[PDB]
Design a protein around this ligand. Structure first.
Ligand code: HEM
Ligand SMILES: [K+]
Length: 291
């Protein structure tokens, strides 16, 4: 199918900045969540998992339909823990009922990245809710117990190349793994609610040991109290990925620019934007607005 972006009736930049602001203000207010990490990271993961179901071969899945609101996707084992992000957005959707679910899920990720001092991420509106029968089956999101070849092949389905894969993986700069959700435990960085290139710095500079966690799964651990999933660690095991990891670890600006492009692309895969559609929006942070 073809999914044409359709702007919420009569809405413009100012309307979406208000939604952005409400999300940002709630992010600031509910600071206790997850031992004070805040909802920033889970909102980014929600935006990615709701977009990552896309299949370039038949345009199924994707962020367009906002299908995560349906139980089949909502209960995907791969999405364990995202219910926290969805619950956070519920009051936002109630105040702005006119925004589509897909626009809200994706905007939530953009808002979180920017408020956490990450790069600006241009965002376009127009996603339209689709029926429950359009919900993609579980199993389209990646496994974490795999190697570089699996990662490379997996992301080709989302039309992402090596650079895009390494940049997107850098989102692990945020949050942590929760044993009860995924069978992995531990954070990737110390400042896990501040978006930066520390994921790459830690991967390259920490001393890693392949250990088994309490769920009997292998994960790389550092004495500093950080982890790297087998799929994260594969980024330094593969020579092509390694060069890019080193590049981002040594150029914060380059990582920001590349992540921004890759993240917008991820959130827009499968969507056809009319030639007369509005230009992408670049929202101001609460800080830039003095709010
Ligand atoms: C090979 C691909 C990837 C794998 C296997 C993977 C796996 C995981 C796992 C196992 C968790 C822990 C979930 C939990 O226990 O709560 C996680 C968390 C997270 N992932 Fe990834 N991920 C991948 C790619 C990405 C990408 C592309 C992004 C976004 C650009 C991303 C963003 C996040 C974020 C922000 C968290 C933290 C969530 C929180 O703290 O609540 N991941 N991922
Ligand atoms: K960080």
């Amino acid at each position: 199918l073809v999914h044409v972006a359709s702007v919420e009736k009569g809405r413009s930049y100012e309307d979406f900045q208000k939604v952005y602001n409400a999300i940002a203000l709630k992010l600031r207010e509910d600071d206790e969540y997850d031992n004070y990490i805040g909802y920033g990271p889970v909102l980014v993961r929600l935006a990615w998992h709701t977009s990552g179901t896309w299949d370039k071969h038949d345009n199924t899945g994707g962020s367009y339909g906002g299908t995560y609101r349906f139980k089949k996707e909502f209960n995907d084992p791969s999405n364990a823990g995202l219910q926290n992000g969805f619950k956070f957005l519920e009051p936002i959707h109630k105040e702005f009922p006119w925004i589509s679910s897909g626009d809200l899920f994706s905007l939530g990720g953009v808002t979180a990245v920017q408020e956490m001092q990450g790069p600006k991420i241009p965002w376009r509106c127009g996603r339209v809710d689709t029926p429950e029968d359009t919900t993609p089956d579980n199993g389209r999101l990646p496994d974490a117990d795999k190697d570089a070849d699996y990662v490379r092949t997996f992301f080709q389905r989302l039309n992402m190349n090596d650079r895009e894969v390494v940049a997107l993986s850098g989102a692990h700069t945020l949050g942590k793994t929760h044993l009860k959700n995924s069978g992995y435990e531990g954070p990737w960085t110390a400042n896990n609610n501040v978006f930066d290139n520390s994921f790459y710095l830690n991967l390259l500079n920490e001393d890693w040991k392949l250990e088994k966690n309490d769920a009997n799964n292998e994960q790389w651990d550092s004495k500093s109290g950080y982890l790297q999933l087998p799929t994260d660690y594969s980024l330094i095991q593969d020579p092509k990925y390694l060069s890019i990891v080193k590049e981002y670890a040594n150029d914060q600006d380059k990582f920001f620019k590349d992540f921004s492009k890759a993240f917008e692309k991820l959130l827009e895969n499968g969507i056809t934007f009319p030639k007369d559609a509005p230009s992408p929006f670049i929202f101001k942070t609460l800080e830039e607005q003095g709010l």
